[PDB]
Amino acid sequence: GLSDGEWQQVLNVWGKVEADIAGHGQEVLIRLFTGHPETLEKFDKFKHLKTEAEMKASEDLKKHGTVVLTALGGILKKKGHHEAELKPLAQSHATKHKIPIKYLEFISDAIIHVLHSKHPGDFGADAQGAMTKALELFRNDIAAKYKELGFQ
Ligand code: HEM
């Protein structure tokens, strides 16, 4: 798990995301979709987006970005004690959305990328290290639920 100091850094970094949840959310999704087009196909409601320009102009994509980061934020504020918040997401993504664990790796990397892009020089080594551990914990706990379901 993460140390108390690491959790503090994670939640301090998250303060940046909360200042503009819609903006960070949009950029994370766009980064995910542009870098890994196979992910866009998992969204029937976003498959119509053929260009990044259309993605950037999609108010529904911004809307979903807000739903996604709000969920993650709630989970992060639990500092590891997130079984109740995490189990339902793990099961909805495996059974309903059919999202390979690899895609969660993609979005984790996208979050780190977006943080550096929006806060260059203000996302230090210790901060990236802590946020990375938090995302891996998130990812690993979802992976455990995936194995339970036998989903690949
Ligand atoms: C930071 C990790 C993620 C979080 C916190 C997250 C969160 C959410 C939330 C809260 C919902 C709506 C409720 C639900 O259906 O469970 C949702 C829906 C969905 N998510 Fe994720 N998600 C994550 C990663 C992914 C990834 C990597 C994909 C891959 C493409 C994905 C695909 C979907 C799809 C297809 C839907 C349904 C959208 C709709 O039709 O309205 N999610 N997600």
Find the CATH number of the domain harbouring 6: 1.10.490.10
Q: Which residues contact residue 113 at a Cβ distance below 8 angstroms, ignoring those fewer than 6 apart?
A: 31
Q: Is 17 in the pocket of ligand 1 (CB under 6 A)?
A: no
For residue 55, which of 79, 30, 76 has the smallest C-alpha distance? 30
Is the Cβ–Cβ distance between 114 and 31 less than 8 Å?
Answer: yes
Is the Cβ–Cβ distance between 10 and 134 less than 8 Å?
Answer: yes
State the distance from the centre of ligand 1 to the C-alpha of 122, rounded, in angstroms: 28
CA–CA distance, 110 with 78 (Å, rounded to integer): 22
Resolution in Å equals 1.7
Domain span at residue 60 reads 1-152
Is the Cβ–Cβ distance between 85 and 74 less than 8 Å?
Answer: yes
Q: Is 24 annotated as a binding residue?
A: no
Into how many domains does the chain fold? 1
CA–CA distance, 31 with 23 (Å, rounded to integer): 12
Is the Cβ–Cβ distance between 47 and 40 less than 8 Å?
Answer: yes
For residue 119, which of 6, 29, 27 has the smallest C-alpha distance? 27
* Phi, psi for 49 (deg, rounded to 5): -75, 105
Q: Which residues contact residue 9 at a Cβ distance below 8 angstroms, ignoring those fewer than 6 apart?
A: 126, 127, 129, 130, 131
